[PDB]
Amino acid sequence: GKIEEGKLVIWINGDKGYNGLAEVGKKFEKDTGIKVTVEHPDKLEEKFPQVAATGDGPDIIFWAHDRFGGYAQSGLLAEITPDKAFQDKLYPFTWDAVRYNGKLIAYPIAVEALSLIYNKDLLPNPPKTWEEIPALDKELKAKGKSALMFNLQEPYFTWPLIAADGGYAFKYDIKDVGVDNAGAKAGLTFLVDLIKNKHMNADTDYSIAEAAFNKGETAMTINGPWAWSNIDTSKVNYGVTVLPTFKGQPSKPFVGVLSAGINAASPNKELAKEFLENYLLTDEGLEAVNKDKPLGAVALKSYEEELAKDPRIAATMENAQKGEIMPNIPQMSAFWYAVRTAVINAASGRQTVDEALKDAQTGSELYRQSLEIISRYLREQATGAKDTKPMGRSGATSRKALETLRRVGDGVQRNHETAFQGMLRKLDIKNEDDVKSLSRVMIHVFSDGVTNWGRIVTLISFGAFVAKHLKTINQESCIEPLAESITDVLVRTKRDWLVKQRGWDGFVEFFH
Ligand SMILES: COc1cc2c3c(cc(C(=O)O)n3CCCOCc3nn(C)cc3-c3c(Cl)ccc4c(CCCOc5cc(C)c(Cl)c(C)c5)c5n(c34)[C@H](C)CN2C5=O)c1OC
Ligand SMILES: OC[C@H]1O[C@H](O[C@H]2[C@H](O)[C@@H](O)[C@@H](O)O[C@@H]2CO)[C@H](O)[C@@H](O)[C@@H]1O
């Protein structure tokens, strides 16, 4: 073991009410004598997978639900089994946000959506459209002010505009990605044109936009409920309202459900359950957090009935209903990373909107595309017959890549039979547990050195060799897990190289 028994360590983002959470933890300690430590480390959503994979990390992690599926896919989250009485206290759709493969993998805390925050002393009537913001910025520049400033370094904040005219992440399946259609292009182009016409600055981040709004220098910002507290201390006469439309269409923020997941490696799962169910998700626990930094529309019905009277919460829910609940599928991280880079590169001029979004599309589709190819190859190699299913969207790439792989990988498997048999014997794979064990070994062997298509063909060809072995020892059910694991090792460790090669299209070109 590694996580200490007898206490609770919690991770929550630095923009949330961690002091109020610590107050709840101090009440928990007063009752039980169990010390609760709340930390807010930088990049905790990226740090948690790494440290939890090795059995460390916090007992409880707080984040929006979109990441948790990935954590659940990697075995890092304990299953949540609250009884009906407690489940009935929270809104069903918040439970739906934290369900993964039919299992509850977190407690939902609160519903978050971005709104347009505006300075009533500068803008008694905020703009209803994105399109009128350039003229409004000219009017405000005439008097020493600016129209709008918001964080351009995180794609969460730009996504409402990208999605307004038809951009989307995953259609409601990981095969259909819409970050590079005409609507996404139109939204990102509007943002880039705002920057080129000096209505916004490409370097603007969270701190810069927050400081400019709370000092009264800019008339609008885009942000979530957690920010209201600081504005309250600013004494700016502010309102919270619906996001402007773009091309006559509502802005569509990605809706997050702040949720608390229990580390699968924690020896304090019953303590964490008691704390979350009977201390935090109460009227007084949620209030203690909310008084620090507002949570949004909390999942607890009794408290949300009080919070819903707040016009700021009504606007939050109006924008949420115009938006969409985030998926929790494990590729969300990759998606976000891709879009993050796109927005930044588009805003700085390092790429055009077309180039940036094409790269984002490649990055977002990489997992499913690689998985389709590798799975089909491994299954047809192990059984001697091919999958009859249609290739689907971007199916030309998958078909062509599978043909290329058939050629090159049967060459590799013929030539490298001795080393392959040796490593297969040295690994000794017998069941589903050893295949789940294979991933750290795979990362080690696939590590350092050069990255080329031939090494990837070697990875996949040895995967096919192992799939053949699994078929022989009557373990066909292990082939699809194996394939998945291989995919995860490939797309994660070689993400940037793969995107630079245009992905499997570059694979196909290289061996043409
Ligand atoms: C140190 O840096 C490296 C290492 C490697 C390189 C290159 C460049 C190329 C290339 O140009 O093709 N290769 C592949 C050469 C194939 O060598 C055959 C070879 N011999 N022995 C003595 C053992 C091997 C050997 C074997 Cl049996 C099987 C797979 C590999 C791989 C793929 C990564 C790991 O996969 C998987 C691993 C596991 C546990 C599982 Cl369950 C699955 C499902 C997949 C590599 N290997 C392999 C050798 C070490 C070279 N290797 C590799 O990645 C490189 O850069 C300078
Ligand atoms: O920008 C990508 C980022 O978006 C969302 O993160 C939000 C988070 O949900 C909010 O609670 C608040 O903290 O702002 C974050 C943006 O900086 C996704 O939840 C996250 O996974 C993703 O990386």
CA gap 465, 152 in Å, rounded: 47
DSSP secondary structure string, 31-83? HH---EEEE--TTHHHHHHHHHHTT-S-SEEEEEGGGHHHHHHTT-BPPP---
Beta-strand relationship, 36-39 and 8-11: parallel
CA gap 162, 164 in Å, rounded: 6
Residue type, 215: K
Residues 6+ apart with CB under 8 A from 305: none
Q: Are 343 and 184 in contact (CB under 8 A)?
A: no
Which atom of ligand 1 approaches the CA of 457 most closely?
12
CA gap 340, 348 in Å, rounded: 12
- Burial string for 364-400 (b: 16+ CB within 10 Å, else e) reads bbbbbbbbbbbbbbbbbbbeeeeeeeebeebeebbbb
CA gap 185, 249 in Å, rounded: 15
Helix axes 182-196, 332-348, angle to 10 degrees: 40
Count of Cβ atoms closer than 10 Å to residue 436 Cβ: 13
Q: How far is CA 269 from the centre of its chain?
A: 25
Q: Could you tell me which residues are beta bridge partners of residue 64?
A: 258
- What resolution in angstrom units was achieved for this structure? 2.0
CA gap 240, 312 in Å, rounded: 5
Count of Cβ atoms closer than 10 Å to residue 56 Cβ: 14
Q: Which residue has the tokens 């977002």?
A: 364
Structure tokens at 417: 């039979």
Structure tokens at 206: 């969270």
Q: How far is CA 305 from the centre of its chain?
A: 29
Q: Are 263 and 61 in contact (CB under 8 A)?
A: yes
Single out the residue of 372, 322, 334, 379 nearest to residue 491, CA to CA: 334
Angle formed at CA 401 by CA 356 and CA 377, multiple of 5 degrees: 130
Residues in the chain: 512
Q: How many A from CA of 366 to the centre of ligand 1?
A: 22
What DSSP character marks residue 243?
A: P
Ligand 2 proximity of 17 Cβ (cutoff 6 Å): no
Q: Identify the nearest ligand to the CA of 331 by its number.
A: 2
Residue type, 352: T
Single out the residue of 48, 31, 52, 21 nearest to residue 264, CA to CA: 52
Q: Are 186 and 245 in contact (CB under 8 A)?
A: no
Which residue's CA is minimally distant from atom 21 of ligand 1? Answer: 419
Which atom of ligand 2 approaches the CA of 206 most closely?
17
Q: Identify the nearest ligand to the CA of 344 by its number.
A: 2
- Which residue stretches of 256-310 are H helix? 269-275, 283-292, 301-307
Q: Which residue has the tokens 């704390």?
A: 275
Q: How many A from CA of 396 to the centre of ligand 2?
A: 34
CA gap 237, 414 in Å, rounded: 73
Q: How many A from CA of 506 to the centre of ligand 1?
A: 21
Q: How many A from CA of 420 to the centre of ligand 1?
A: 9
Q: Mutate which of 438, 453, 462 to test ligand 1's pocket (most atoms within 8 Å of Cβ)?
A: 462
Residues 6+ apart with CB under 8 A from 309: none
Q: How far is CA 14 from the centre of its chain?
A: 17
Q: Cα dihedral sign for 262, 267, 270, 274? A: negative
Residue 176 φ/ψ, nearest 5 degrees: -95, 105
Which atom of ligand 1 approaches the CA of 427 most closely?
39
CA gap 413, 409 in Å, rounded: 6
Ligand 2 proximity of 112 Cβ (cutoff 6 Å): yes
Single out the residue of 184, 498, 511, 505 nearest to residue 367, CA to CA: 498
Find the Cα–Cα–Cα–Cα dihedral 48, 206, 320, 325, rounded to 10°: -30
Determination technique used? X-ray
Residue 493 φ/ψ, nearest 5 degrees: -75, -25
Q: Are 23 and 291 in contact (CB under 8 A)?
A: no
Q: How many A from CA of 159 to the centre of ligand 2?
A: 11
Q: Identify the nearest ligand to the CA of 110 by its number.
A: 2
What phi-psi label fits residue 216: left (phi over 0), alpha (psi between -120 and 50 degrees) or beta?
Answer: left
Q: Could you tell me which residues are beta bridge partners of residue 90?
A: 300
Single out the residue of 98, 38, 40 nearest to residue 67, CA to CA: 98
Ligand 1 proximity of 486 Cβ (cutoff 6 Å): yes
Q: Are 130 and 190 in contact (CB under 8 A)?
A: yes
- Which residue stretches of 88-176 are H helix? 92-97, 133-141, 155-164
Which residue's CA is minimally distant from atom 19 of ligand 1? Answer: 419
Q: Could you tell me which residues are beta bridge partners of residue 261?
A: 61
Q: Are 361 and 474 in contact (CB under 8 A)?
A: no
Q: Could you tell me which residues are beta bridge partners of residue 170?
A: 177
Q: Mutate which of 154, 159, 316 to test ligand 2's pocket (most atoms within 8 Å of Cβ)?
A: 154
CA gap 81, 83 in Å, rounded: 6
Ligand 1 proximity of 415 Cβ (cutoff 6 Å): no
For 152, what's the count of Cα atoms within 13 Å in the CB-facing half-sphere? 21
CA gap 81, 74 in Å, rounded: 19
CA gap 423, 425 in Å, rounded: 5
Residue 460 CA: distances (Å) to CA of 22, 155, 310, 487, 497: 48, 33, 56, 9, 17
The long-range contacts involving 272-278, CB below 8 angstroms and separated by at least 24 positions, are 272/8, 272/59, 272/60, 273/80, 274/32, 275/8, 275/24, 275/25, 275/28, 275/36, 275/60, 276/60, 276/107, 277/82, 277/86, 277/107
Structure tokens at 505: 């299209």
- Looking at the chain, the residues that come just before a C–N gap of over 2.5 A are 172
Q: Mutate which of 156, 230, 293 to test ligand 2's pocket (most atoms within 8 Å of Cβ)?
A: 156
Q: How far is CA 278 from the centre of its chain?
A: 28
Q: How many A from CA of 454 to the centre of ligand 1?
A: 10
For 506, what's the count of Cα atoms within 13 Å in the CB-facing half-sphere? 15
Beta-strand relationship, 60-64 and 8-11: parallel
Q: Are 212 and 96 in contact (CB under 8 A)?
A: no
Q: Mutate which of 416, 430, 433, 445 to test ligand 1's pocket (most atoms within 8 Å of Cβ)?
A: 445
Domains annotated for the chain, with CATH where assigned, are 8-112+256-308 (3.40.190.10), 115-252 (3.40.190.10), 369-510 (1.10.437.10)
CA gap 262, 79 in Å, rounded: 8
